[PDB]
From a paper:
The thin filament consists of [name], tropomyosin (Tm), and troponin (Tn) in 7:1:1 stoichiometry, and Tn is composed of three subunits: [name] (TnC), the Ca2+-binding regulatory subunit; [name] (TnI), the inhibitory subunit; and [name] (TnT), the Tm-binding subunit. Tm is a long α-helical coiled-coil protein that binds over seven [name] subunits on one of the two long-pitch helical strand of [name] filament and forms head-to-tail connections with adjacent Tm molecules to produce a continuous helical strand along [name] filament. Upon Ca2+ release from the SR, however, Ca2+ binding to TnC causes conformational changes of Tn and a shift in the azimuthal position of Tm on [name] filament to allow [name]–myosin interactions. Here we have determined the structure of the entire thin filament from human [name] in the absence and presence of Ca2+ by fully utilizing the recent technical advances in cryoEM and image analysis.
The resolution of the 3D reconstruction is 6.6 Å at a Fourier Shell Correlation of 0.143. The density of the core domain of Tn together with a long two-stranded coiled coil of Tm is visualized clearly on each strand of [name] filament, with one of them at a higher position than the other by the axial rise of [name] subunit along [name] filament. The Tn core model thus built binds to each strand of [name] filament over two [name] subunits. The C-terminal region of TnI comprising the inhibitory region (residues 137–148), regulatory switch (residues 149–160) and mobile region (residues 163–210) is present as a mostly continuous density (red) extending up along and between [name] strand and Tm coiled coil from the C-terminal end (Gly 137) of the TnI helix within the Tn core. This density, identified as the C-terminal one third of TnI (TnIC), reaches up to the second [name] subunit above the one that binds to TnCN. The other one (dark blue) is also highly elongated and is extending back from Gly 199 of TnT across the [name] filament strands and down towards Tm on the other [name] strand to form a long N-terminal α-helix making a specific interaction with the C-terminal end of Tm near the head-to-tail junction. This means that the entire Tn structure is extremely elongated, binding to [name] filament over seven [name] subunits, of which the upper four are bound by TnIC and the Tn core and the bottom three of the opposite strand are bound by TnTN. Therefore, the conformations of the TnTN linker region (residues 151–198) connecting the Tn core and the long N-terminal α-helix formed by TnTN residues 87–150 are distinct from each other for the pair of the Tn complexes, indicating the flexible nature of this linker region, and the axial extension of Tn2 is shorter than Tn1 by one [name] subunit.
Residue numbers in the entry:
A (entry chain C): 1 to 188
B (entry chain A), C (entry chain B): 1 to 375
D (entry chain Q), E (entry chain P): 11 to 65
The structure:
Amino acid sequence: DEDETTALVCDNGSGLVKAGFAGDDAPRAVFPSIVGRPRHQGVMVGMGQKDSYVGDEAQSKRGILTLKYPIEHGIITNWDDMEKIWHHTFYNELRVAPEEHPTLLTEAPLNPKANREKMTQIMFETFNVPAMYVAIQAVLSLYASGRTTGIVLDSGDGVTHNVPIYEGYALPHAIMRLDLAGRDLTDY
Amino acid sequence: DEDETTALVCDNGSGLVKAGFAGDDAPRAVFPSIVGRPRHQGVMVGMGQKDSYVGDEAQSKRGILTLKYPIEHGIITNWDDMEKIWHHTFYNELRVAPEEHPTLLTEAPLNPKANREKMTQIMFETFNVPAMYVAIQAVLSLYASGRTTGIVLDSGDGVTHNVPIYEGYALPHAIMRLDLAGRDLTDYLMKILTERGYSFVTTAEREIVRDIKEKLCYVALDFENEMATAASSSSLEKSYELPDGQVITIGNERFRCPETLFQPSFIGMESAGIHETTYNSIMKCDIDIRKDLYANNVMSGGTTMYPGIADRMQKEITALAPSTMKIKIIAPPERKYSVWIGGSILASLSTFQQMWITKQEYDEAGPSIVHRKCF
Amino acid sequence: DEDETTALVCDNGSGLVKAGFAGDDAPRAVFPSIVGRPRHQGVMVGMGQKDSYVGDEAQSKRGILTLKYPIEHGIITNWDDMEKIWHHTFYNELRVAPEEHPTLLTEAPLNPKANREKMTQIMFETFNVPAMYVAIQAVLSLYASGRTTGIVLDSGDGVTHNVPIYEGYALPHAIMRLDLAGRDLTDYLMKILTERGYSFVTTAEREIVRDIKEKLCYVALDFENEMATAASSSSLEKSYELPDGQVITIGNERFRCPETLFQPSFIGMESAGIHETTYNSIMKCDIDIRKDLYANNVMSGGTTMYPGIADRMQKEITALAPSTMKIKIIAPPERKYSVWIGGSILASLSTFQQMWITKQEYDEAGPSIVHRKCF
Amino acid sequence: LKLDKENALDRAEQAEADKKAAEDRSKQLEDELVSLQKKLKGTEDELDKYSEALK
Amino acid sequence: LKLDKENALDRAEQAEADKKAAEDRSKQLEDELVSLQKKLKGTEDELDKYSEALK
Ligand SMILES: Nc1ncnc2c1ncn2[C@@H]1O[C@H](COP(=O)(O)OP(=O)(O)O)[C@@H](O)[C@H]1O
Ligand SMILES: Nc1ncnc2c1ncn2[C@@H]1O[C@H](COP(=O)(O)OP(=O)(O)O)[C@@H](O)[C@H]1O
């Protein structure tokens, strides 16, 4: 539904997925990083009912669903559910088919390599995106905040990476990764 | 008389049985689930006199018959009597031989398994039905009532099942089956009428009381105030003419009997009553489910036909319910006939044409097949 | 009747209460957590009939009583009924009471705070106990098992806690609270026995089913193989005589109910199952802890008495666990009675004599003291 | 009397036919009313959320 | 025919009473449905005003 072949941006956290197009100041829509599945035996015939629900569908029908998060502490392990979320996100609600738009994804610098590799593989092989770029949260946070220099303490849902940047340069020896995030605060 | 092999549908309760063909919106005929037998020898000429009577025949000659109901608290225990009922129902009143038409029968979600096995077996081995399907009464109640989500109170003659359903799914952890039903209300009414000087102890008398109950009794929205008034003034009494010309009136007994639904201890049952039983079905369900069940409390089956039951039940659940939530009871005119109607709806759905057991699969597997093919 | 100046110990759940005095290796008596009340109006003179029944009185007379259980998934809410249960327990049957002895009561590690506050308060204010101590069931389960380190699988009547301890320290983030216990298994068996033609609805009937389960049911080392045979042949069925002269046999249901522990979905519960919760209590602990917890998987509470559970839980964890390492389950005769025993050990250890709240500190601080002195 | 069971029956059947049309309207109107009232409360709840967000 | 007239008549009168009740219930619900529709339009307009006053 867009009138320009801008890049797409999709911030796939362990909590929620914020997505929209590049050049804007906000995601156009926010979806949970969830694929839901029924935990009950169907009783009635001709009720429709999906084998799995995606994003906002998973929360909307959650009364009888178990809701799973494909991403654990920032890393995707269930790529199949990620593909479902992305297809819904890009084609049904954001109305941007990746085939016609380059796509940028986000991740902690110490997020294990499989995350950036699998996300890149899926956008190129199941979505046919013309181009890809996996960006680092510390970089992204300083740009959003109007800084080139500072400490990015991302107290997000998954893992906190705590990464210092000076004059645009990484200072990797000073990174303190902490296994504490919003999901644990909720559990407490 | 049909121009298509439509399924035949029969809702066989412990009380009455309703029958018609799939695609209609009502049964074509209603029979009691009774096979009657004489306990006396007839003397006069031109008095009929059969070895056994079926359905409406058992009621017409009931004055001297023992009336046996082959279904006990939802389960068929007497298959020979159900064959008599189904032959008469399908062949004489619906005017269709099952041999050329598939048949749909119904049972409660926790109805003993032997019921579904005999319903299926009888139609395949005695009537040679080309296919069978035992339906869930909860489904049929929802399809007749226009719901996919809600509480099913099927208040039958033998059992009140009580099952919450959400988005077409059962929520089995919250089923609170209650052994208090329409049959106990008839028995209790025979006893309370006896207290007033009108003793009913025989099977013929049981049917008379059943008819009295259906026309004269109600639950009352406020038992204690209605009781105090009925016990103090003739203004709440109602008369009924008995078959021998005697007249019976009912006072606070008119509601004290129906009150057994709310107070099961009156018949010796350990229960908190129909409204707590119903409530137990709505609060036990998950936090994001409860709101939809409260707003969709669905009645099917009989006893739902008491003049004040839809309103007292809505009031009692509202009293037990948290604030904010909307409590509503759906009590359609298809009351007592709703399960049959739902059966018609299910039998004919395109989404249900693959659910039928054929008379091929049946013979290869045997009667236990209903366990894997129906639900 | 006792003259030993020791502490008293009680384990109080939604089903049973184990009790006796500290320093021994077993409870002196086990009482139901029941206050029974008549559910019928007496007619004849000279028929006895109490206003209330307590513990075993309530269970023995249950055919005509409604049985109330004061504890809800580990928390006492009906403190008045527990005071009656405790009076009977201590004063009438164990023949020893808190007035002359320090008393230890137990609870699960994440049990709502009000439970320990009321347990402390009732012993101090209605029983006049000289001292109190509310204990953690996990602590007691390992003492009674000869461990300082291990996973406690405290499967009780209303809740299974699943809680690790290492070198005497709690590992609380690894606790997997589960809403599945012996009472839910009984309710499930009532529903599947209904499927077999033997409906159980009332609480007296619930107690009949709990007796059937405790004597006839098992989990099985290999569920699917036992199921396929039991669901196909009478050779796997076992008879039980019901207290009305009927005989009930149970086939695959004999194990399907107990199976719920491994598959909670059978009762509509959202859970991975007891073997995965056990695995996670081990796996969520640090890597130099994990190996010691794998080697020290400790059963406590009841349900641990099902045939195949000690062998099956070890099989299910070793199948998930890494190789070379030894995985072991501890499942002594003190099974189901081990929490009480642990209470005896904790109450009597010299290392614990400074942990008691005296009726000095309590009277000045009030019941909130339990959070300053116990845990 | 001769045609009165018929006059009464036709009245009963006509009244039942109209009753049903009107009872079905009552159910449709009540379901719309309740849903509409829930929409009302949905929006009223939102009026407060926006009023609160506004203040 | 008295029995048929009486049955037809109890039904004629009850059906007429019930059709009247159905027409009155559907009329009151239609009027209340409209009141709820108007009150809903009210909350929707107030909602947009609060939502806009808020934006
Ligand atoms: N007006 C009424 N008052 C009291 N009880 C009623 C009334 N109408 C129906 N019932 C009772 O409900 C039962 C009817 O059973 P039913 O629901 O038709 O079984 P099924 O659902 O399988 O067809 C009988 O006990 C009948 O007396
Ligand atoms: N033989 C048995 N078979 C199956 N389950 C059992 C058996 N014995 C005990 N259990 C279960 O455990 C419960 C009692 O164990 P217990 O842990 O001592 O409860 P609590 O901790 O509340 O005192 C009973 O309700 C029963 O359901």
